[PDB]
Amino acid sequence: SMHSDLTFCEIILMEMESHDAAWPFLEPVNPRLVSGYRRIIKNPMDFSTMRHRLSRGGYTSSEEFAADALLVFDNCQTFNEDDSEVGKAGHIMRRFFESRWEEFY
Ligand SMILES: CCc1c(-c2csc(CN3CCC(N)CC3)n2)[nH]c(C)c1C(C)=O
Ligand SMILES: CCc1c(-c2csc(CN3CCC(N)CC3)n2)[nH]c(C)c1C(C)=O
């Protein structure tokens, strides 16, 4: 299970999930809604996957948590055009994440 020293990450993730721009990223990208995603994106990531990994002890360090957060946003900008609704949401969420991370680092 998660070590208590990572509680600050648990909180950041909770706040990200609650953000107005988080809706694209809550669950894995869904093949029922778009084709050819895993064809291009080799390491899919989403906030529910992160939440369960963090709670079960799958992240030893805050750096691993942050790398998965950035992977969400990196995948988003790889797959989606900046002008799309999902693309714009990824940019909002990256800024929000970086602002919360910078309080600690
Ligand atoms: C399919 C487009 C997409 C969504 C997306 C579209 S709709 C949604 C949330 N939506 C809520 C209602 C549920 N019934 C189904 C899922 N996420 N997200 C991401 C990260 C996408 C891509 C291609 O990068
Ligand atoms: C979440 C609804 C949805 C969208 C979608 C994309 S864009 C949009 C409207 N809208 C614009 C501004 C945002 N702040 C919130 C959502 N709904 N696509 C798909 C395939 C959906 C489902 C039900 O599967």
Side-chain angles (χ1 to χ4, degrees), residues 20-21 23 33 85-86:
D20 179 79
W23 60 271
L33 305 178
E85 294 300 317
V86 173

Side-chain angles (χ1 to χ4, degrees), residues 23-25 27-30 33-34 37 72 75-76 79-80 86:
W23 60 271
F25 312 111
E27 296 295 333
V29 175
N30 194 336
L33 305 178
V34 60
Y37 187 80
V72 176
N75 290 341
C76 187
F79 195 77
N80 301 280
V86 173

Side-chain angles (χ1 to χ4, degrees), residues 3-18:
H3 193 278
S4 64
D5 284 339
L6 299 187
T7 304
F8 78 103
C9 294
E10 187 179 35
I11 290 163
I12 288 172
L13 182 58
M14 177 190 68
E15 292 172 327
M16 286 199 295
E17 286 174 333
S18 286

Side-chain angles (χ1 to χ4, degrees), residues 39-86:
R39 191 181 72 78
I40 290 317
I41 299 301
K42 288 312 124 87
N43 293 109
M45 188 50 55
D46 68 277
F47 295 160
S48 282
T49 297
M50 292 179 62
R51 187 175 74 250
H52 295 326
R53 185 163 305 169
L54 180 60
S55 63
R56 75 167 70 98
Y59 295 130
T60 300
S61 78
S62 62
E63 290 188 9
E64 286 184 81
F65 168 86
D68 276 352
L70 295 181
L71 181 58
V72 176
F73 315 134
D74 287 349
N75 290 341
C76 187
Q77 86 188 341
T78 302
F79 195 77
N80 301 280
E81 284 222 72
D82 288 328
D83 78 83
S84 70
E85 294 300 317
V86 173

